[PDB]
Amino acid sequence: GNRGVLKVYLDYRRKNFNFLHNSTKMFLDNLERVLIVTGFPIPPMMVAETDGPPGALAIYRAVEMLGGKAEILTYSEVEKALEPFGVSLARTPEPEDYSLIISVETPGRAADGRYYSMSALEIKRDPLDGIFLKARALGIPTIGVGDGGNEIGMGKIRELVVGHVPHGEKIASVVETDELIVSAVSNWGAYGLVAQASIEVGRNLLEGWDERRVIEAISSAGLIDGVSKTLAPSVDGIRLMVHEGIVELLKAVVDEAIK
Ligand SMILES: [Zn+2]
Ligand SMILES: [Zn+2]
Ligand SMILES: [Zn+2]
Ligand SMILES: [Zn+2]
Ligand SMILES: [Zn+2]
Ligand SMILES: [Zn+2]
Ligand SMILES: [Zn+2]
Ligand SMILES: [Zn+2]
């Protein structure tokens, strides 16, 4: 129940009614070698959180089911966490190397060049948005998912963030992405991408996704809850039940269309 981002969605979707469909389409048309990027350090521990990795993983799993290849660029602690899922890690990634670069909950620099958390605490850690500024310049397909306004891709709608989101002027990221997905919780944004791509392809790419398994797993591995900054199996302060609810609802929707 976060009011600012809810208002940014109404504004955004209102003028870009088809962002999810356009996003899903760019995705489906550039599967050859997809670089997926996640990991949001949380001040002051600067430890990544549970929002982002789950979604990146679902996209990765989906990219492979479709026949493409995916690698993940993220932080150390997330690699450990995502380790049980046998995910290919990116090694000295170069934009030129991919056909598409996605971002699920990743700090995007602000207008002042620095990085900030929803609480405007500066993030001090090596950035991961650079490759996006480069991807953009080269014209490589780029997609970004966020739920607050300080994530890579949110630069596409800074006016909206600055207007409805607390600390906006300072927090808002200037990094833009070709397509942008905004959702209450980024993971859910990635799941939407997968559900939309499922309807488009006629296969439910989300069938089998175990929300609970993944949250608990990565929470044990060390990834924290962004709001409680604790080690609870939750993402952005919402507990597993609601999250499973949304994933099960997305699955239902995918089927309804496919079948
Ligand atoms: Zn407005
Ligand atoms: Zn280059
Ligand atoms: Zn505040
Ligand atoms: Zn966020
Ligand atoms: Zn989040
Ligand atoms: Zn279509
Ligand atoms: Zn968060
Ligand atoms: Zn259920």
Residue numbers in the entry: 11 to 269
What text does the study give?
Here, it is reported that multiple zinc ions can easily be charged onto the surface of proteins with no intrinsic zinc-binding site by using zinc-containing solutions. Here, we show that the surface of proteins can be charged with zinc ions and that the anomalous signals from these zinc ions can be used for structure determination of proteins. In conclusion, we demonstrated that protein crystals grown in the presence of zinc ions or soaked in a zinc-containing solution are easily charged with multiple zinc ions on the protein surface and that they are suitable for zinc SAD/MAD phasing. Considering the high phasing effectiveness and multiple zinc-binding sites, we believe that zinc derivatization of the protein surface is a largely unnoticed but promising method for phase determination of protein crystals.
Recently, we obtained crystals of TON_0340 in a precipitant solution containing zinc acetate. Based on our confidence in zinc derivatization and phase determination, we collected a 2.3 Å resolution SAD data set from a crystal that was cooled in a cryostream at 100 K after briefly being immersed in a cryoprotectant solution consisting of 20% glycerol, 5%(v/v) 2-propanol, 100 mM sodium acetate pH 5.0, 350 mM zinc acetate. The TON_0340 crystals, which contained six molecules per asymmetric unit, belonged to the tetragonal space group P43212, with unit-cell parameters a = b = 107.44, c = 355.03 Å. According to the plot of 〈d″/sig〉 versus resolution, zinc anomalous signal was present, although it decreased drastically at high resolution. Additionally, three zinc ions bound to a cluster of six acidic residues were located in a putative active-site cleft.
